[PDB]
């Protein structure tokens, strides 16, 4: 009962006369909503990961993924992928998220260097031919491809960079192959003393053991939740309930609140609306393009008015700053909040236990 909730808060079996703050209430959500865009069509992940021929690492390919449904569970669970390492999401969560885009990058490297792909690494892959940004958000996915790629005399069609004037920046692409002048003399034409071609080709023959063997790498990079999602995880959208407290999920923007018709004239390019607080206060539904205000679910302090246990066990409860309709015979609305278990009387008295906004409570016949 509210009295034992005071005894617990005061840590006393006996309570002195007064109004006591106790564990504050919050209106619980009635159900959940999901709203993702009603795209039907799976993404070209087959065309990324089963591709007939990958690029060399210096020649690293980028494919866009956009306007589709992305079932990353099928990647994460596939025994074939030998490393699957993630740097800003956990893979089991990928199916719950929505992404603005994915840049799916594909290329081949030697299997010993599968540790060099991680953001902030050092070593020739990381420095001289393919660098991730240090805040890379995405997952690096790799497997040994000897069994399809490798040839007894060696598929020297696959290449990596040995020389560069500087370590490259994140996602720099270099199609140039002109001579690296390691000597103090510059040098025109195809060769010279300490003049080099910047490339070396992998001797990918199956007589080389693991580590020296070829390792296909796909890097998926994405940015999240802050803009119109083009690609999302496979989740069914629900009906959009309104005017009731609810756990909403719009495009992975999870939250709890009451959803109301919005009078905000968003322009066609907007999708989230934001308060002065730097918090989302409106959203465009992704299946019907109407704006909804996200008002917070009602909440407030719960104070128990105790006339003192030397006098009585009876108590009245103030739900601070809320209506008399939100808490579900002796219910009184006050400016201080909804007061439950005290009777309103027209007889003024001296102040006794204060409630706020001119209201005061007391124990009488």
């Amino acid at each position: 009962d509210p009295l034992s909730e005071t005894k617990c808060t005061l840590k006393s079996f006996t309570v002195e006369k007064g109004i006591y703050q106790t564990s504050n209430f919050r209106v619980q959500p009635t159900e959940s909503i999901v709203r993702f865009p009603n795209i039907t069509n799976l993404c070209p992940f087959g065309e990324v990961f089963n591709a007939t021929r990958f690029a060399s690492v210096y020649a690293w390919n980028r494919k866009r993924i956009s306007n589709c449904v992305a079932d990353y569970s099928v990647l994460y669970n596939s025994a074939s992928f030998s490393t699957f390492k993630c740097y800003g999401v956990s893979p089991t969560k990928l199916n719950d998220l929505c992404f603005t885009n994915v840049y799916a990058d594909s290329f081949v490297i030697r299997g010993d260097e599968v540790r060099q792909i991680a953001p902030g690494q050092t070593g020739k892959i990381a420095d001289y031919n393919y660098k991730l940004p240090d805040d890379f958000t995405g997952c690096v996915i790799a497997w040994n491809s000897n069994n399809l790629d490798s040839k007894v005399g060696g598929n020297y069609n696959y290449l990596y960079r040995l020389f560069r004037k500087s370590n490259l920046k994140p996602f720099e692409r270099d199609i140039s192959t002109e001579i690296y002048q390691a000597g103090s003399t510059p040098c025109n034409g195809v060769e010279g003393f300490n003049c080099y071609f910047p490339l070396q080709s992998y001797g990918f023959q199956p007589t080389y053991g693991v580590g020296y063997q070829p390792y296909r790498v796909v890097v998926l990079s994405f940015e999240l939740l802050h803009a119109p999602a083009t690609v999302c995880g496979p989740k069914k959208s629900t009906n959009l309930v309104k005017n009731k407290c609810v756990n909403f999920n719009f495009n992975g923007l999870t939250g709890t609140g009451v959803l109301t018709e919005s009078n905000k004239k968003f322009l066609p390019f907007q999708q989230f609306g934001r308060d002065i607080d730097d918090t989302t206060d409106a959203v465009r539904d992704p299946q019907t393009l109407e704006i909804l205000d996200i008002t917070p679910c009602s909440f407030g302090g719960v104070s128990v008015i105790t006339p003192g246990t030397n006098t009585s066990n009876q108590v009245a409860v103030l739900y601070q700053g809320v209506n008399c309709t939100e808490v579900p015979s002796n219910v009184f609305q006050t400016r201080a909040g909804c007061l439950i278990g005290a009777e309103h009387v027209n007889n003024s008295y001296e102040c006794d236990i204060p409630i706020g906004a001119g209201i005061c409570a007391s124990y009488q016949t």
């Binding site: 918090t279 917070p296 407030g300 700053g321 001119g358």
Partner: peptide
């Protein structure tokens, strides 16, 4: 003289009608 964060403003015990009355 002129929300999700968990902030609230409590009313004064004495309203401006009662301060004016005193």
């Amino acid at each position: 003289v002129t929300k999700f964060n968990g902030l609230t403003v409590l009313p004064p015990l004495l309203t401006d009608e009662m301060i004016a009355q005193y």
